[PDB]
Structures are given as structure tokens and as C-alpha cells.
Amino acid sequence: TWLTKIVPDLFRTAGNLHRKLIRLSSDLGEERIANPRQQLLFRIEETRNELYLLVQSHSPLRVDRLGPGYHQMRNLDPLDKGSRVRYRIVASPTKRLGRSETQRLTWLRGAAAEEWWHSRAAANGLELLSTYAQDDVRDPGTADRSRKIRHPAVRFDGEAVISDVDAVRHAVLNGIGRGKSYGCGLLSLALI
Amino acid sequence: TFVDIHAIQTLPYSNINRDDLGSPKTVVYGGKERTRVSSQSWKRAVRHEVEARLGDKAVRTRRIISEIAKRLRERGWDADLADAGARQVVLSVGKKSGIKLEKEKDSEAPATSVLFYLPVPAIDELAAIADEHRDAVAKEAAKKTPKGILPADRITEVLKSRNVSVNLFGRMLAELPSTEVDGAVQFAHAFTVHGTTSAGTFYRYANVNLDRLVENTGDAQTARTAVAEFLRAFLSTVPSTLPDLVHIAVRFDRPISFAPAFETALYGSDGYTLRACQELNNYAERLREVWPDDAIRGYATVENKTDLAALGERYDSYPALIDAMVAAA
Amino acid sequence: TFVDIHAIQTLPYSNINRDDLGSPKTVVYGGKERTRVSSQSWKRAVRHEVEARLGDKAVRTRRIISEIAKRLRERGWDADLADAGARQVVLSVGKKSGIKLEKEKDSEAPATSVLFYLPVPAIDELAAIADEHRDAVAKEAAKKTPKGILPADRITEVLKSRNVSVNLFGRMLAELPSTEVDGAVQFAHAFTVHGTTVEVDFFTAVDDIPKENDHGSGHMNAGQFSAGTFYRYANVNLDRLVENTGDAQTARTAVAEFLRAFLSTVPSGKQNATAAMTLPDLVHIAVRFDRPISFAPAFETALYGSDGYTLRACQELNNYAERLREVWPDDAIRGYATVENKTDLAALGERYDSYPALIDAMVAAAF
């Protein structure tokens, strides 16, 4: 993978955030499996002005119109088990259930979000997830370009001893939780 | 007259307190960032274990009116009279017209603007005071803007009642400064000995001002149980591991935290427990030489690799240490 | 004739002294922001520990009349005569008609406009002076606008009485310039050696009576605290303290008592939430005869960080003390006491094993 610090300017909506992330990468690929996760990822870091954002990626980004005045960028290749390292992350805990008139949506509170998350990591890296328990988007009018929704993210943080390296790294590259294209998924680690 | 307790305790990642964004709270101390557990959190864990073990519980609530309403409703009052009577309870006291209330919420009694902190049986006694004046409450319930009919002195005397937690940690009420109680415990923010960028070996410190705790409870025997119970809660509880080392000093002049001992962060690569215990030992030795005192010291440790001579007489167990230093005070 | 005391003292996430909005007070010194503890706060902590240890307490109060009223009421006066007599006490003195009073409050005696600062037994003596003249007070209590009947000279002589705290820190009265006492102590604002950014702790109070579908945290707020190694400095002008107390023996006890209070005490603001009690890492008492010199310029260049500031602060104060003794030659009796043994710190004079030994040696070196 490879990491960059980038910052869009004029961002009014989340979908245009997605599009500004894909229009700077020409050769794009998508390798999918029926039920498993798709194989960029990204995290919103400062949103009231322009919008600074950390991107994880496979294909190299170069500045575009109204981009940075420079191409930071580093290419990284990943992490010994038993050792603790800093984590991080935004995701959307949900419960899907039959809806009157299907619906994404202990169990809310800060304890089934912790249950949900450590479910997400599973045998990979053991961690503690900052529990949130509370973003809107609409289509920019372009045909076949989504529509309008709501949503709710949660950020999580600390050091996460990993129990399987290739598989937590697998999780780092695949992403944790739905809506990866709308801010979620990216797990960030650092040595303790 | 000052009992201060020091403690080194490694902690698991899950038990750490979080900030507003989910990251564990940190101090940039000694120039190096060190994760910390806020004092109010561990203090809350201590007060709940103390109330649960000593049996008497105090309640810090913004919704006192609703609770008085359940007691008046179980006394045979109609729901509307129970609500009007509890409003009379908070309306009859304070300088201004009444205790200020938050904006009214649909279907529920309004919360007071400030958090009341009173024992549970005192809330029930407030219900009894609103109960014996049921007819006057019924008459003021018919008026558009009822006034505080209940006696103010009786209610203020109920609101002055102190739990062990109130005696120990103090309370504050801005509208009723007569009820404010000075806390007898100083609880420091537990920070890591080493820089952390979570897990680590936290340093923990706390004071107990015996003169104020004896002044609050009045009798020295309940203060004695309160102190011993506090120290045991300090060692046992986790905000939601046992401390690696504990050092109770009974000092008469002034309490002294050993937090400067760990201002120079430990380098690492090796287990911080032995170096933290040995460093707290050297700082305790150097302070007893620099600041001479007759304070009764004493410690209890898991590691046996070192004698740690400066921390006073060694005791085999934490309860033996607590009993010896409380009996020494 | 000048005893100055320097001190390096670390405080861990204390926030002992807050501004008007709750943030710890800061100096932009050397171009870099450094949290500071105001001098009046640590001075208040010093005067209360000195009064508590030396036994005599002085009272800075804006409501003297009410206190004289309790003493006259315990002497057998009626409440109304006690109030009229205490009004006569403040009405009988000063250039103008009387000491000006704040707007009258219901049910309570009015507070004076300015803060009186006098020892407690002197207030009781004012009660005795108002007591002897009880009949004249009763006659003026019947008039609509009573005048100052009590003798002005006796009251002014009672208001001139000095406590140790008055002798040490001085007082100011604008209506009675005869009572003003020059302070014998210069107390500097304790700032950090290193630059400190204010650290914000987001906190919430949890409600104990739950409602459905809500953990129901009761309250939210952001309380800002900070930590660091403060530099502290203070002077004692022996000529003025000897002039104030009169006798050199009470000045000697006052100086030794002051220096010990300077080392022992802490501000005490927000200490229940954070135990900031700490002993200074290094203390350096110099007994200078020409003029006092603070080593605050030594820490104008803020320390960079990442490593423990205590050793570098002590070593830097050492180099600046050495440089100043070479640049400004003097026969001043120096001396220091330190916790760290990693360095000898040669310029700070003779080393003493303990703070009380150092205080006793330098005070004995000055009186």
C-alpha cells in the first residue's frame, strides 16, 4: 500500500469527496469476491475549511486542479505479534432488520459498539474501540450517481496487539465496516 | 493528619478513560506525552465501590423532581399532585423564587439546572415533607404560578445530610451554599511513568485530610472506617489489575506526591515496573533526607527483587498495610 | 540585607491558578508562551501558612462593621446598638465624613468600599473602644445623621497595629495613609522554564437516575490544565522587615518562617481534582548585600524538550549563577539544596543536605 496527506479545496458533499478521490487516479482496478470485501481507503481529518484527509492507496496520486501546490507521499510496505502499536479508525456500526413498508441501522450505547468492533477485528488484532453513538449526503444531480441518505460514523483508538499479522494487515488493506467510500474503513497503526 | 497513598499499577488497554473523540487522555509531562486516567473517573469508581461496600449510597442527579414524584406516587398521591408536590419541593428553597429548572420536556418532569448530590434516604425524607402538606400543595396546584409553600428550613436541613461519599469527596451547590461540604480527599490524575504513543505502568496518588474528614463525619470512628474503606477502594477499583506497589505514608505536616520522580520519562525496552519501583524508592529516600519528618511510612509490594528501604516498614499484604497505617493515624 | 530565594519546582497537570475563563495564566516570555502562577496567589498561600504556623492571623476584609457588630453583641449590646456603634467606628475616622460605605444591603451591615487589613485582636480592641462610649453612641443612634463621636486618635492607633503578614507583605489604605506599611517581600510570578501549550481535558458528569434509551450523562465541559517545571523567585528586604517589626529577633523568625513557607506551600486551586502537592526540585538561597538579582533571564530561551527539564533547568540556573557571579562580583553568602545528586552545581555555593538546614544556615548568616 502507500500513504499520502492530501487536501481538496473548492467539498460541499460526501459523494463529491469520493469523486475527487477517484478522478486523480486513471488506471483503477477492482478485484471482487462474492460476499467478501472489495479490494483506496481514506479518513476525514479536518472538515470545516477545505478538508484535510489521509489517503491509503494502491495507485499513485498526483496533484490536480486546485490541489496541493506539490504532488506528502510515501509508499509503505507493512509488524510483530504480541507487540502493541497505535490503532485508529472510523466505521458505521449497524444492525440490519426487516423494515415496515431491508434496513441498515446492549446491543446505540457504548457496549455493543465495542462488541461489534471486536467482532470486526476477530482473530486479527486485539484492540479497544472508541465508542461513538450518534453525516448527510445527496446526489449532485449526475445520472446514476447515488441519491440521498443520512448515516452515522464512529471513531476508535489506541494500541492494538495483533494475533495474526497477515490477516490484520489484510483487514488494514480491505477496510473495516461498510461505507468505506464515504469516509469509513481506514485503520491506522504506529509503533508504541 | 494527612494520609497519602502512592501506587504503581500497570493497566490493561480496555480500562483507560477516553476523551471526547475516543483517544485516551494524555499529559505532555516532562516534555513527553504520557497517557493518563482522569481523576474524576477513578474517583467515581472509588465512590461506587465505597458506597456498595459500606452500604450507603448517595445520588448525583439532575432529575430530583421525578424521583420525589415516584415516592409521592407510592405514598398514594395522584400523578398530577405528585408532580406538583415535587415542584413545590424545589420551588420552596433558595434565594430567588426557586431552584432554576431546565426547559420543560414533554411527558416528563423538568430537570434542575444543577446536579443535586444527596443520599437516598434524604430524598425519601423530602418526599415525606412534601407529603404532610398535601392540602396546601393541592391548593397551590390549582393556581397558575404556585409559590414555595413548604418550610424552607426543614428542606434545607434534609439537603444538608451527608453520605460517606459526601463526607469524603465533598459537594457543591451554588443556589444553596449552606449545603456545600469541603472534600477531604485529593485525587491526582494517574499518568504513565513512561512515554506512550494504550498500555503502561501508571503512577497514582491520593490524599486524605483527616482533620476535614473527622470534621465532616464528626466522630472519629466513622472517619476511621471511611479512611480504611477509601484506601482499600483506591487499591481495588478500576474505572471500567492489582497495583504493583503501594506506599502509604501518614504525614503530619503536609502531603507530598512523588510525581516529580517520574517527570524524566523512562527510556524503555525493558520492564518498567522494577525501574519505577526503584525510582520511587530513590525519590522517597531523597525527600526524607531533604525534608525531615516523623511521618509513619509503610509499603507493600509484589516484587521481592528489591528491599526498597526508604519506603518504610514492609507489610506482607495490602489489607495488613492499610490496617497498620490507619491504626497508626 | 537582601535575602533572595530561587526555586525550581515541577507541578504535574496541576492548573493551580486560573484566569477569568478557567485557563491557566500564561506569559509570552522569550517569544514562547509559558504557563505561570500569579504571585498574589502563591503569596496568599504563603501568608496563610505563615499565620497558621506563627499563630497570629490578620484579616483582609471588606466587611469590618459586621465583625465589630458580633463583638459588641457578645459584649451585651443590643443588635441595633451594636450596628450603630460599629457604624460609629468607621464614621469617626478619615479626612471626609467617614470611611465610605458600599450601597446598603438588606438585613446586613454595609461593607466598606476598601478592604481593611488588620490583625484579629486589633478588631476586638476597636470593639472595646466603641464599647466604652456606649451612651454617646446611644445618643447619636437616635439622630438621623450621626457623626463620628469616637476619638479618632485611638482608632487610628488601633488600625496601625501590624501583624507579621502586614510587616512582611505590607498594606495599603487610601483613606488612612498613616496606616500604610511598606512591604518587605518581592514575590515574582512563577513561570515555566519551558514552553507549554494549554492542555484541554474534556469532561462529563454522569446522571444517576436513568431514562430510557439514553445513558444520560448530565453535564459536559472542557477544563484546561497544564504541567511543567516552574521557576520561582522572591526577595526579603531585611532593612524594611527590621524596620517594620522593630526588633531584629522577630524579624529573624519572620524571615525563617517566610522562607520555609515559600518552600512548603502550594496555591491549592483545583487540588481536589488534581493532587499538585510537590516539593521544589532545587532551592538556592543567596544573602546579598548590594541588590537582589532574579535568575529569570536564565530561562528566557525556552528549553526544547523531549527530555526531563529538571536536570537541564538546574544546570542552566547553575551556569547563569556562575556567569553572574563572574560578571557582577560580590561577597554574598550563597547556598543551595537539591534533590538530584547527578551534578555538583558548583556555582550555587555551599551545598546543604536539607531545606531546613539551608534556611537555618542562610538566616543565621544574615542576622
mmCIF file of C-alpha atoms in Angstrom, chain B residues 31-204:
data_model
loop_
_atom_site.group_PDB
_atom_site.id
_atom_site.type_symbol
_atom_site.label_atom_id
_atom_site.label_comp_id
_atom_site.label_asym_id
_atom_site.label_seq_id
_atom_site.Cartn_x
_atom_site.Cartn_y
_atom_site.Cartn_z
ATOM 1 C CA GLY B 31 8.230 17.082 27.596
ATOM 2 C CA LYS B 32 6.959 13.639 26.651
ATOM 3 C CA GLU B 33 3.364 12.592 26.059
ATOM 4 C CA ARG B 34 2.053 10.171 28.677
ATOM 5 C CA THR B 35 -1.426 8.680 28.696
ATOM 6 C CA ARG B 36 -3.435 9.489 31.811
ATOM 7 C CA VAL B 37 -6.592 8.385 33.559
ATOM 8 C CA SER B 38 -8.550 11.374 34.755
ATOM 9 C CA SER B 39 -9.042 11.718 38.474
ATOM 10 C CA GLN B 40 -12.789 12.137 38.295
ATOM 11 C CA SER B 41 -13.127 8.734 36.654
ATOM 12 C CA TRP B 42 -11.137 6.730 39.165
ATOM 13 C CA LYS B 43 -12.812 8.820 41.871
ATOM 14 C CA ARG B 44 -16.204 7.763 40.557
ATOM 15 C CA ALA B 45 -15.130 4.139 40.579
ATOM 16 C CA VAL B 46 -13.923 4.596 44.126
ATOM 17 C CA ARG B 47 -17.113 6.191 45.342
ATOM 18 C CA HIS B 48 -19.266 3.489 43.816
ATOM 19 C CA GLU B 49 -17.230 0.711 45.328
ATOM 20 C CA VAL B 50 -17.228 2.504 48.706
ATOM 21 C CA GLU B 51 -20.964 3.059 48.632
ATOM 22 C CA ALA B 52 -21.508 -0.541 47.569
ATOM 23 C CA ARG B 53 -19.262 -1.931 50.297
ATOM 24 C CA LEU B 54 -20.228 0.427 53.132
ATOM 25 C CA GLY B 55 -23.917 0.114 52.140
ATOM 26 C CA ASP B 56 -24.981 3.760 51.998
ATOM 27 C CA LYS B 57 -25.403 5.301 48.569
ATOM 28 C CA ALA B 58 -25.571 8.935 47.520
ATOM 29 C CA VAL B 59 -27.132 10.097 44.314
ATOM 30 C CA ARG B 60 -25.815 12.796 41.997
ATOM 31 C CA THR B 61 -28.797 13.521 39.815
ATOM 32 C CA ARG B 62 -30.198 16.267 37.685
ATOM 33 C CA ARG B 63 -33.695 14.762 37.947
ATOM 34 C CA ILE B 64 -34.642 15.048 41.604
ATOM 35 C CA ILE B 65 -38.221 16.117 40.904
ATOM 36 C CA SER B 66 -39.048 12.930 39.030
ATOM 37 C CA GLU B 67 -37.666 10.755 41.818
ATOM 38 C CA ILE B 68 -39.599 12.597 44.503
ATOM 39 C CA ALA B 69 -42.573 12.087 42.221
ATOM 40 C CA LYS B 70 -42.231 8.301 42.350
ATOM 41 C CA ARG B 71 -42.084 8.400 46.138
ATOM 42 C CA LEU B 72 -45.126 10.621 46.420
ATOM 43 C CA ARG B 73 -46.924 8.411 43.895
ATOM 44 C CA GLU B 74 -46.190 5.338 46.009
ATOM 45 C CA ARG B 75 -47.500 7.248 49.054
ATOM 46 C CA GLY B 76 -50.953 7.423 47.467
ATOM 47 C CA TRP B 77 -50.773 10.755 45.656
ATOM 48 C CA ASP B 78 -52.265 11.244 42.238
ATOM 49 C CA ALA B 79 -49.686 11.602 39.498
ATOM 50 C CA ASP B 80 -50.524 15.258 38.954
ATOM 51 C CA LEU B 81 -50.379 16.011 42.661
ATOM 52 C CA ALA B 82 -47.110 14.131 42.920
ATOM 53 C CA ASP B 83 -45.628 16.272 40.165
ATOM 54 C CA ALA B 84 -46.959 19.482 41.669
ATOM 55 C CA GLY B 85 -45.706 18.492 45.101
ATOM 56 C CA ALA B 86 -42.217 17.736 43.878
ATOM 57 C CA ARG B 87 -42.204 21.048 42.065
ATOM 58 C CA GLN B 88 -43.123 22.608 45.372
ATOM 59 C CA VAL B 89 -40.129 20.893 46.951
ATOM 60 C CA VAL B 90 -37.673 22.603 44.632
ATOM 61 C CA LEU B 91 -39.736 25.804 44.427
ATOM 62 C CA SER B 92 -39.754 26.411 48.179
ATOM 63 C CA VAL B 93 -35.968 26.702 48.616
ATOM 64 C CA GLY B 94 -33.197 29.056 47.545
ATOM 65 C CA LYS B 95 -32.709 32.819 47.430
ATOM 66 C CA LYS B 96 -34.639 33.512 44.221
ATOM 67 C CA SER B 97 -38.125 32.171 43.529
ATOM 68 C CA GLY B 98 -36.876 28.604 43.313
ATOM 69 C CA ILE B 99 -34.196 26.272 42.093
ATOM 70 C CA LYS B 100 -33.868 27.016 38.382
ATOM 71 C CA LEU B 101 -35.294 24.344 36.102
ATOM 72 C CA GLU B 102 -34.291 23.275 32.633
ATOM 73 C CA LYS B 103 -36.682 23.786 29.729
ATOM 74 C CA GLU B 104 -39.704 21.583 30.050
ATOM 75 C CA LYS B 105 -39.625 18.228 28.298
ATOM 76 C CA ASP B 106 -42.809 16.568 27.089
ATOM 77 C CA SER B 107 -44.400 13.980 29.420
ATOM 78 C CA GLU B 108 -41.581 14.230 31.972
ATOM 79 C CA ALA B 109 -40.811 16.391 34.979
ATOM 80 C CA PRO B 110 -38.178 19.049 34.286
ATOM 81 C CA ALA B 111 -34.614 18.527 35.362
ATOM 82 C CA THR B 112 -32.980 21.004 37.688
ATOM 83 C CA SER B 113 -30.240 23.111 36.159
ATOM 84 C CA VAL B 114 -27.630 21.923 38.666
ATOM 85 C CA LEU B 115 -26.756 18.386 39.800
ATOM 86 C CA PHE B 116 -28.005 17.592 43.295
ATOM 87 C CA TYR B 117 -25.834 15.243 45.357
ATOM 88 C CA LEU B 118 -27.668 13.744 48.299
ATOM 89 C CA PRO B 119 -28.137 10.348 49.943
ATOM 90 C CA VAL B 120 -31.136 8.241 49.024
ATOM 91 C CA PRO B 121 -32.948 8.251 52.385
ATOM 92 C CA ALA B 122 -32.725 12.042 52.385
ATOM 93 C CA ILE B 123 -34.642 12.145 49.112
ATOM 94 C CA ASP B 124 -37.297 9.987 50.742
ATOM 95 C CA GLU B 125 -37.455 12.410 53.667
ATOM 96 C CA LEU B 126 -38.014 15.239 51.206
ATOM 97 C CA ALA B 127 -40.939 13.199 49.951
ATOM 98 C CA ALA B 128 -42.299 12.976 53.490
ATOM 99 C CA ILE B 129 -42.013 16.745 53.948
ATOM 100 C CA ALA B 130 -43.923 17.310 50.754
ATOM 101 C CA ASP B 131 -46.373 14.689 51.978
ATOM 102 C CA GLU B 132 -47.553 16.159 55.273
ATOM 103 C CA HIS B 133 -48.521 19.416 53.493
ATOM 104 C CA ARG B 134 -50.726 17.684 50.928
ATOM 105 C CA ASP B 135 -53.715 20.039 51.152
ATOM 106 C CA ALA B 136 -51.646 23.202 50.827
ATOM 107 C CA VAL B 137 -49.986 21.638 47.801
ATOM 108 C CA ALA B 138 -53.404 20.822 46.371
ATOM 109 C CA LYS B 139 -54.445 24.446 46.782
ATOM 110 C CA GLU B 140 -51.317 25.784 45.139
ATOM 111 C CA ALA B 141 -51.608 23.226 42.355
ATOM 112 C CA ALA B 142 -54.795 24.975 41.253
ATOM 113 C CA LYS B 143 -53.098 28.403 40.899
ATOM 114 C CA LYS B 144 -51.325 29.394 37.697
ATOM 115 C CA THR B 145 -47.969 30.245 39.345
ATOM 116 C CA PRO B 146 -47.708 28.400 42.655
ATOM 117 C CA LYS B 147 -45.239 29.632 45.269
ATOM 118 C CA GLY B 148 -42.979 27.767 47.658
ATOM 119 C CA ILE B 149 -45.324 26.814 50.473
ATOM 120 C CA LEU B 150 -43.201 24.150 52.149
ATOM 121 C CA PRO B 151 -40.970 25.221 55.039
ATOM 122 C CA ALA B 152 -37.558 26.154 53.766
ATOM 123 C CA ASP B 153 -35.719 25.275 56.955
ATOM 124 C CA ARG B 154 -36.892 21.659 57.038
ATOM 125 C CA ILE B 155 -35.941 21.102 53.400
ATOM 126 C CA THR B 156 -32.572 22.776 53.782
ATOM 127 C CA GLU B 157 -31.916 20.535 56.783
ATOM 128 C CA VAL B 158 -32.668 17.482 54.669
ATOM 129 C CA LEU B 159 -30.448 18.710 51.837
ATOM 130 C CA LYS B 160 -27.588 19.142 54.309
ATOM 131 C CA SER B 161 -27.465 15.422 55.157
ATOM 132 C CA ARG B 162 -24.120 13.878 54.331
ATOM 133 C CA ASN B 163 -23.271 10.482 52.956
ATOM 134 C CA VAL B 164 -19.841 8.949 53.440
ATOM 135 C CA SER B 165 -19.160 9.936 49.835
ATOM 136 C CA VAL B 166 -20.222 13.488 50.591
ATOM 137 C CA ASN B 167 -18.059 13.487 53.696
ATOM 138 C CA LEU B 168 -15.156 12.136 51.695
ATOM 139 C CA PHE B 169 -15.294 13.930 48.359
ATOM 140 C CA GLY B 170 -17.385 16.986 49.168
ATOM 141 C CA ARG B 171 -20.223 18.555 47.243
ATOM 142 C CA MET B 172 -21.109 21.898 45.707
ATOM 143 C CA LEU B 173 -24.491 23.557 45.271
ATOM 144 C CA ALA B 174 -24.445 27.133 44.030
ATOM 145 C CA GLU B 175 -28.011 28.056 44.970
ATOM 146 C CA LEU B 176 -27.632 26.609 48.486
ATOM 147 C CA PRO B 177 -24.147 27.459 49.752
ATOM 148 C CA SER B 178 -25.179 26.194 53.179
ATOM 149 C CA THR B 179 -25.082 22.614 51.863
ATOM 150 C CA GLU B 180 -21.585 22.772 50.370
ATOM 151 C CA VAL B 181 -19.154 20.360 52.015
ATOM 152 C CA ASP B 182 -15.384 20.614 51.739
ATOM 153 C CA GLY B 183 -13.852 17.486 50.283
ATOM 154 C CA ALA B 184 -11.419 15.531 52.414
ATOM 155 C CA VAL B 185 -9.677 13.721 49.530
ATOM 156 C CA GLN B 186 -7.252 14.937 46.872
ATOM 157 C CA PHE B 187 -7.222 12.555 43.925
ATOM 158 C CA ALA B 188 -4.442 13.017 41.357
ATOM 159 C CA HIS B 189 -4.601 12.224 37.642
ATOM 160 C CA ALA B 190 -2.943 8.839 37.129
ATOM 161 C CA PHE B 191 -0.318 9.249 34.396
ATOM 162 C CA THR B 192 2.201 6.795 32.963
ATOM 163 C CA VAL B 193 5.732 6.612 34.228
ATOM 164 C CA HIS B 194 6.952 6.248 30.629
ATOM 165 C CA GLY B 195 6.100 7.986 27.383
ATOM 166 C CA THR B 196 3.320 6.290 25.435
ATOM 167 C CA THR B 197 2.374 6.960 21.841
ATOM 168 C CA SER B 198 -2.812 2.191 25.087
ATOM 169 C CA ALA B 199 -0.975 0.411 27.907
ATOM 170 C CA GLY B 200 1.540 1.219 30.586
ATOM 171 C CA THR B 201 2.534 1.489 34.225
ATOM 172 C CA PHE B 202 0.548 4.314 35.782
ATOM 173 C CA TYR B 203 1.606 6.309 38.817
ATOM 174 C CA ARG B 204 -1.277 7.016 41.194
#
